Amino acid sequence: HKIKGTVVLMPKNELEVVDNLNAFLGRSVSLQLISATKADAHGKGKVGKDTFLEGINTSLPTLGAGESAFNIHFEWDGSMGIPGAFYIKNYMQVEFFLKSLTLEAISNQGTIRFVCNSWVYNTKLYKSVRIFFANHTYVPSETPAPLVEYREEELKSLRGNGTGERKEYDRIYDYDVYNDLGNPDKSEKLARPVLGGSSTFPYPRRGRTGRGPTVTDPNTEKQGEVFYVPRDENLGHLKSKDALEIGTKSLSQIVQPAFESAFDLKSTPIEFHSFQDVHDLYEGGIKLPRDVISTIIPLPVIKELYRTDGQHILKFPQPHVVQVSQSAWMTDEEFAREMIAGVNPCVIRGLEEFPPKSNLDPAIYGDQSSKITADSLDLDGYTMDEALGSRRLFMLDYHDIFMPYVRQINQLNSAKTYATRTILFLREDGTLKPVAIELSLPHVSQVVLPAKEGVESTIWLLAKAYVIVNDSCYHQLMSHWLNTHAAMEPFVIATHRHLSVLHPIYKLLTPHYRNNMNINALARQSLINANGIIETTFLPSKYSVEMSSAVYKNWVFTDQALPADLIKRGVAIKDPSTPHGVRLLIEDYPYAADGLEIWAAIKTWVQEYVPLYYARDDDVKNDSELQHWWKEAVEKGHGDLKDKPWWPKLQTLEDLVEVCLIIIWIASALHAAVNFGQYPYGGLIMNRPTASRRLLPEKGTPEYEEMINNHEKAYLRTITSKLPTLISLSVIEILSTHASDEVYLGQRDNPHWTSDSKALQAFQKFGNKLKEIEEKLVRRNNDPSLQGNRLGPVQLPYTLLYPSSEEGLTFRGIPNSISI
Template structure:
């Protein structure tokens, strides 16, 4: 506690410090793109040296260009603010420091600190250079009457003239608002005021202002009618979570829409301040949309390669032999480092993708009914299957608008292994994957495009051996006489041979197309990326960096606003990648808004979700207080282990700072934070009665656990299996282009004679497949500097030893869980964990190596 103290304060004593910073990373996307087909590595290497190529050069460059001033936590000036020390400049660079990471440099600094200044707990920093740098840490050694003080900064610092007030950083001490030392109170309040801004003007690159806006930046009406998209959010008709405000000018044709920009603003510290070695996965989406995809489209426009697969082997050739593309296309994409990492290209004009996990052992097991059902429990979208409680399934669509939407599946057509429908329902053995209500309101419009799809319901039965089997699929279309006339439905039953087996395979494909689109736009984008962004904004606006809940939550927000901005720019925007390759096309985000109407924050807790979906029942005698109706449900089994561990960590941490419920109620920052989350960030749902009031310790623990679960484990479960499962497009098509052929038509005859060709002409074609694979491979990869659950970027994230001990307990428990889950995957009785494709369920294993690993829980939504 008093390490390094040598005695009483000495007049004029100097405090020695070490400053670690990272020079501006010139290896950004724009540098790479501008290189084209040149010597990329040579330009990158020279770019690193733009700011100081040697130790002496770097020291000389910085010279007297960066100054710091310490601020006291114990001694006040005449205004009641902590005393500010003298300007002190960086000194010589430290040649070697074992803790330095890639691209980081350390500098000595010595502060004059008289005995009447007390103990420092903050500092100002001024940058007099024109170029910004990334400030990592300041460490003070041998501070009199204290010892070592750590400042964990992790922030971009621009020229001081760009700031209205000097940049301030606080030590890693934790204070509730009411416990803040009086000399720091005004500094704490001023910093929050600076981060909130005034809600006006266009945001500039250097700013750190956090504010809210609606999704009015997805379209570009100035480019024509095809680029017009409705404003999402800000109304009961199209509600949505808020995004970060940029303040860009409106478009000419629609004052409610914001003009797209080449570079989207996010608060500067939400930009990536860490190196990702040479992979640059976070910029992969931009390089794909601006370079690779136009190259693909050009190749197909020139008819260099047919846009159809003719056999299943043609699809497998994407991984086994590659696809030939024109030399100019290959030369356009191959110099980009991110692309080199993802694809294999060679001098034979061949583009080759890595083999997806789903076909690494068996090439055809994906076609089985067992695998089709298993992926609802252990696939990339395992949170949609529900226990069926009534038969036939009913719709929640308004019958005055949509007529009778009740399912046409009858009990007599389903093979239930000798059970009656009443017995199967009573014993909890019937389940449903139901996309009927999500797609039906949009299906008429979708089918007016080149896409042709159904709204689907799939009924499944739990067999005696504990595995699921599909027993019926319902394919529904809007009634030709109008929406209020109900639907036209056909029921498809399992078949193993003849044309009926092809029809059954196609029916499963229509189900998976529904599932793929719901997964990408709702389970993945909406329920993790979009819903978390308001919590990020509110946290920075209302919770000081000194606040314990800020320290608890912010590691789980790393990179999310940036990746969301990239998504709005290249993925979910008008004519973006998702619209090009997924069924709903221009209606995708609008459909996710309809789903958000029914989003309930407390139900994002895994136990609540499982109970709501009738996949579990409350049972005080069972672990976690509930009993799974399908015992072998890998997502739920593994997820409950992770959920409970997160909740225990949150409980341990929160209890260090709040002793009673009254402590929660009087925490002004915490109450303002929650009020803003509800009324601003998720303002379109602010009147819902289910919002926690945040008046008790129990509520605070649950709220924080849900946030951390959503940003870490839930996102991992629905993200990092995308390429392992969906990289083989036959298994997870994203488009359907024609309906089931009718007898007497040429398409029906083709289906009889060539089932593979009929299947391939129905699902995603070759160009869209290449785009799909390119994107989901990036999304499924871990970057080289990923930070996983149970880890922190900096070991000195807090000075509270009890918090550090609780965190170590959390990390140790996660390690135990990982070993436990590995054993489960070797249990032959747990068929859903392995399946006919022989792919163990590892998506909720906490750790991972770099790359395409099909495992690992990052702290945050970082890709």
């Protein structure tokens, strides 16, 4: 009596950026089945004999690209029971990627499926044998008794002991602080503060790498050529062009030096002179020396970012925001519209008092009452009283965020900034109108009003640029990096440390983690590190990541839920008569209106999945894996905030739903909404300037005269210089691209991720609901009454929360995870 099995795997070279299939035969790969129902004398499931792959199975039609299938037969007599797990031992010298095992039975119901999706190195490298479980879901108390120890031992394998340098083939999840970003052993000027583990610099934890201390600072971790992630977080890709995450490394270590050399050799003018010089980047391109182009175009990923003639030309793609109107970005209407439908749509707040007030210490900064007067504003005939009472006043407030850093920034050689406020008025036609900008300095502090003619219209244009320099920095460092990438990683770590792969909540959440540790590790190495891409292109330079620590002090997990966010920002009110429980004070608000549809669908899914496994509130309390998971995520992963009173306790069904819903929301729709618009809106540097280099010119200076005679040059002298523009355009093009192997909301990588047909059916309903939401959002973008805020003068429909997308730079599609 034998059991027929099929093993599907991919050899190593299919997923890299030579293999031989017959080498897998012979005695080179062993599997041993493990009983779920018959135990040995110590209560452990009985283990069968070593069994080797017999032959190649080419007669299998369900195979995907790069996959190979092998037949196997298992001798399994009547003493052995029913198999529920297996061990595998790879005796080859090379690792392979194990997809699945499927055992055949007389009936289709008796098929047993194992979904593995795991790299398997040579067995001498591992401390304990690699084990895999069948696809049945179990809360711990429901685990078959012969599998209990194994389930617990594998969780111990994933946690390690807190020590040691991590090597490529390790699968060990643990926490550390952000002490790996500085490079003091290269130069003292590259020292950076440790972020995390203090009340001065609180921060989420990141994945532990264990490379040990620098020579000059025992607090900082020494450099490495590879920044470890647990092996099965280091994703391979069938197509080299899909390894976008690796492009950030190539950009920093190969492309940026090549660009810098072109500027050092005066082979191209160092500054833009006119707005046409910027538009040229996507029309005729920029001309560079042949050795720079020959440095750039052989590189995977990087070569996809540009068109070239192979000799002198690099062209950038035309950004969405200039596809219909080259100039509409300059309009006040677009400036305000992008606050509710642009790259960073989640900062604007309602104003219930006037004037707005500061929360900083007057002993250090001064009177910080706004200098905006009520009677200087044109509110289309409303008094201030009426506008406040009707909730038609809003603001973009960067005053208290930036004021503590402006002095230090303004002492950097390549930066000058204001701390800004923007007052907006909601017209009767439903669009926002900017009515005043306040530009403040600590320790002059000016109010600028709109103006279409004269030198004052140029001053207004520059005031908008300083606002958007604030907003670009806040978007990249806080809305994007802190609130999604950095805040999510500790939950990834805790999940693998404490929820068995068997666990229903592991299965629910882990699709929403795909590639997140991997892109984050590459970002610590090349994006957010000292002298990295963010420091050399965004305003705060060496203060960039530490500013995000100051903002994390006020981060609140439960305020990341979309309805809570909208209430807290005063852009909606609670209203149980509405379908979503909130009424939007800006009715057409596209990010919020579309987001509420997606939020509701995810909520329905979580609410239909959890009660499959947790019938009563007690069942949540009694799940030891779930309780250890949430205790560790809060008290280690976000441990600098562990004292705060707003953390859910996780003692009820409602808590479990809330926590799962918020995590899925951050990782999918929130990240998509702030990420995939970066090149579409920001690929024109004038529209989203990353830095400012001077303050407003004083009257009677040649800089003031220039401002009168050549507004374009005055604008370009103020914002990001040409060389950092090239670098930042390249990085946000990468970050805005969907890889062809992306897994979107409503999709999963394997359709047999669980054997529970009820869960499978609830998941199908979720995917159907998303397709109907997409149709609803299409209709909104076609509704002429919503054109003012959904399309605007740039005539660009808001598609960033359409759930589906094709590959590429599409301005749509919601991935499952923080994948790029």
